[PDB]
Design a protein around this motif. Structure first.
Motif, PDB file in Angstrom:
ATOM      1  N   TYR A   1       0.899  -1.384  -0.221  1.00 26.77           N
ATOM      2  CA  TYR A   1       0.038   0.141   0.193  1.00 26.77           C
ATOM      3  C   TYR A   1       0.972   1.214   0.068  1.00 26.77           C
ATOM      4  O   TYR A   1       2.201   1.152   0.482  1.00 26.77           O
ATOM      5  N   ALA A   2       0.476   2.139  -0.725  1.00 25.28           N
ATOM      6  CA  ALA A   2       1.082   3.526  -0.716  1.00 25.28           C
ATOM      7  C   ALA A   2       0.206   4.168   0.464  1.00 25.28           C
ATOM      8  O   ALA A   2      -1.086   4.067  -0.036  1.00 25.28           O
ATOM      9  N   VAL A   3       0.754   5.031   1.279  1.00 27.73           N
ATOM     10  CA  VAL A   3      -0.027   5.526   2.311  1.00 27.73           C
ATOM     11  C   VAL A   3       0.345   7.002   2.457  1.00 27.73           C
ATOM     12  O   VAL A   3       1.901   7.287   2.352  1.00 27.73           O
ATOM     13  N   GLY A   4      -0.338   8.009   2.524  1.00 25.79           N
ATOM     14  CA  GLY A   4       0.144   9.337   2.391  1.00 25.79           C
ATOM     15  C   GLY A   4      -0.828  10.441   3.170  1.00 25.79           C
ATOM     16  O   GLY A   4      -1.898  10.161   3.686  1.00 25.79           O
ATOM     17  N   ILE A   5      -0.247  11.599   3.567  1.00 25.25           N
ATOM     18  CA  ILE A   5      -0.959  12.544   3.836  1.00 25.25           C
ATOM     19  C   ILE A   5      -0.874  13.894   3.122  1.00 25.25           C
ATOM     20  O   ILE A   5       0.246  14.394   3.163  1.00 25.25           O
ATOM     21  N   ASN A   6      -2.001  14.453   2.826  1.00 24.59           N
ATOM     22  CA  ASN A   6      -1.967  15.580   1.970  1.00 24.59           C
ATOM     23  C   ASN A   6      -3.001  16.478   2.119  1.00 24.59           C
ATOM     24  O   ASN A   6      -4.049  16.160   2.583  1.00 24.59           O
ATOM     25  N   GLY A   7      -2.735  17.977   1.799  1.00 22.33           N
ATOM     26  CA  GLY A   7      -3.532  19.031   2.176  1.00 22.33           C
ATOM     27  C   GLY A   7      -3.546  19.984   1.193  1.00 22.33           C
ATOM     28  O   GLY A   7      -2.409  20.218   0.363  1.00 22.33           O
ATOM     29  N   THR A   8      -4.748  20.611   0.949  1.00 21.79           N
ATOM     30  CA  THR A   8      -4.851  21.908   0.094  1.00 21.79           C
ATOM     31  C   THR A   8      -5.495  23.083   0.515  1.00 21.79           C
ATOM     32  O   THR A   8      -6.395  22.911   1.646  1.00 21.79           O
ATOM     33  N   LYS A   9      -5.122  24.416   0.194  1.00 19.50           N
ATOM     34  CA  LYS A   9      -5.691  25.648   0.652  1.00 19.50           C
ATOM     35  C   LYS A   9      -5.849  26.584  -0.712  1.00 19.50           C
ATOM     36  O   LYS A   9      -5.008  26.685  -1.296  1.00 19.50           O
TER      37      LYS A   9
ATOM     38  N   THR B   1     -10.477  24.497   2.179  1.00 17.23           N
ATOM     39  CA  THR B   1      -9.028  23.815   3.052  1.00 17.23           C
ATOM     40  C   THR B   1      -9.600  22.174   2.937  1.00 17.23           C
ATOM     41  O   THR B   1     -10.611  22.217   3.413  1.00 17.23           O
ATOM     42  N   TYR B   2      -8.767  21.659   2.621  1.00 14.74           N
ATOM     43  CA  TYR B   2      -8.831  20.089   2.527  1.00 14.74           C
ATOM     44  C   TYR B   2      -7.612  19.250   3.188  1.00 14.74           C
ATOM     45  O   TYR B   2      -6.638  19.631   2.805  1.00 14.74           O
ATOM     46  N   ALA B   3      -7.909  18.254   3.555  1.00  9.52           N
ATOM     47  CA  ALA B   3      -6.587  17.118   4.234  1.00  9.52           C
ATOM     48  C   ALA B   3      -7.149  15.922   4.104  1.00  9.52           C
ATOM     49  O   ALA B   3      -8.476  15.355   4.745  1.00  9.52           O
ATOM     50  N   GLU B   4      -6.402  14.865   3.981  1.00 10.82           N
ATOM     51  CA  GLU B   4      -6.470  13.565   3.836  1.00 10.82           C
ATOM     52  C   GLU B   4      -5.470  12.567   4.352  1.00 10.82           C
ATOM     53  O   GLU B   4      -4.277  12.942   4.161  1.00 10.82           O
ATOM     54  N   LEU B   5      -5.930  11.433   4.882  1.00 10.92           N
ATOM     55  CA  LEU B   5      -5.026  10.354   4.897  1.00 10.92           C
ATOM     56  C   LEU B   5      -5.507   9.390   3.759  1.00 10.92           C
ATOM     57  O   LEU B   5      -6.479   9.267   3.356  1.00 10.92           O
ATOM     58  N   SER B   6      -4.667   8.899   2.946  1.00  8.76           N
ATOM     59  CA  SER B   6      -4.821   8.326   1.636  1.00  8.76           C
ATOM     60  C   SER B   6      -4.134   7.026   1.737  1.00  8.76           C
ATOM     61  O   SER B   6      -3.071   6.917   1.826  1.00  8.76           O
TER      62      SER B   6
END
Length: 388
Positions: free
Chosen positions: A43-51, A56-61
């Motif tokens: 699995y590729a696991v990531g944390i990413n955000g935008t503004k 404003t957005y954030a996630e664990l993916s």
């Protein structure tokens, strides 16, 4: 067989930053961090955000592209979103949501994929200036807010089934010349949800070259939205379709197209604040031409084009009888149009997009925006996180 050692032991980590500016979005940031074989799991696991100005957005993916040896992929997401509608040039509200999505993807063949997933979302709405379309959704849900009180809480918990289909046979990634891209994205609510609705969108882009050298190309795009309620409820306004702006109808201020808010008093009030709607159609025809006078050393770094954009949005539940003395925002036929020029440049500082368009067909309330511009760039730095 022994290459399964080095594969299951390799792990890379990537930081990514992004900066950008647009007339739609304002100043834009991206930041993200991930490992692509986390704990040697595949699995590729990531944390990413935008503004943006409005979002404003954030996630664990979590995502594994070889969930099966055949190429079926299993993907996941946990997210928080904050959306501030009035910085998106809509009538005001605040939507703070969070939830989760899990998505099976299937590669039918080298040009077609399909998706099936389940999603959960919680939505928290507040700061809703009372207005007709919005309040009619609220009343359909059993809520009876006061129409003089400039607040709310309204909260919903939805679970969805989500499907999609993407066809892609463009010849090239950045400056396409030939072929089509289709995308369909649907959802429907499943029992247990507070909302009760379906929503379906279709996007198509088709490039047709005239000359053998593929320097003159006609491009036709279309965009189509429809959703509605199922049990007497409406599709929630927070899922409305919009139109106008750089990516849909140039020459129009972002989202300005379609219904406008009709506000209750603190003797109702007309306004120029867009609220979108549950139905939408957009289309464009674009003539791609060589770019004068640059010489064919920079050729495919730049691209120029003349366009005729058009579109419309409407409220299928607007009751025009009852609001006889307001514009009929259920009429699909109020079609906006613009004509302009467009310039794209794979510049040293990333993708760059310059629009100048005149809207020659525009209705009471609609807000012009001739000059439209978009720039942005992404750095990606890698690090080996291996298990040798």
């Amino acid at each position: 067989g022994e290459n399964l050692y080095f594969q299951h032991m390799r792990n890379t980590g990537s930081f990514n930053f992004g900066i950008g500016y647009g007339t739609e979005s304002g100043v834009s940031f991206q930041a993200g961090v991930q490992q692509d074989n986390w704990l040697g799991t595949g699995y590729a696991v990531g944390i990413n955000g935008t503004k943006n100005d409005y979002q404003t957005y954030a996630e664990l993916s979590v995502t594994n592209p070889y969930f099966t040896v055949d190429g079926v992929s299993l993907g996941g997401r946990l997210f928080y979103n904050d959306f501030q509608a009035d910085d998106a040039d809509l009538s005001d509200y605040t939507n703070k949501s969070y939830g989760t999505d899990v998505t099976l993807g299937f590669p039918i063949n080298e040009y077609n994929s399909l998706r099936a997933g389940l999603g959960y979302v919680h939505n928290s709405l507040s700061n809703m200036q009372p207005q007709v379309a919005m309040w009619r959704y609220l009343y359909s849900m059993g809520e009876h807010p006061s129409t003089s009180d400039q607040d709310n809480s309204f909260k919903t918990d939805d679970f969805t089934f989500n499907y999609g289909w993407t066809y892609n046979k463009l010849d090239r990634g950045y400056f396409p010349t030939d072929g089509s891209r289709v995308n369909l994205t649907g959802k429907v609510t499943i029992p247990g949800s507070d909302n009760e609705y379906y929503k379906v969108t279709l996007d198509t882009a088709t490039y047709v070259p005239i000359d053998d050298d593929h320097k003159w190309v006609v491009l036709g795009r279309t965009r189509w939205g429809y959703g509605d309620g199922l049990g007497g409820k409406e599709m929630p306004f927070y899922e409305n379709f919009y139109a106008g702006g750089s990516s849909t109808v140039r020459g129009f201020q972002s989202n300005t197209i379609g219904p406008k808010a009709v506000y209750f008093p603190h003797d109702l009030s007309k306004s120029d604040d867009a609220v979108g709607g549950n139905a939408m159609a957009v289309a464009s025809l674009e003539f791609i031409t060589p770019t004068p006078f640059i010489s064919d050393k920079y050729a495919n770094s730049v691209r120029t084009s003349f366009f005729w954009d058009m579109g419309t949005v409407w409220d299928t539940n607007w009751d025009s009888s009852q609001y006889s003395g307001y514009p009929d925002y259920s009429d699909p036929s109020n079609i906006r149009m613009s004509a302009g020029i467009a310039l794209q440049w794979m510049s040293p500082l990333g993708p760059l997009v310059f629009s100048y368009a005149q809207p020659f067909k525009k209705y009471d309330g609609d807000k012009a925006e001739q000059f439209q511009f978009n720039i942005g760039k992404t750095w990606m730095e890698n690090v080996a996180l291996d298990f040798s």
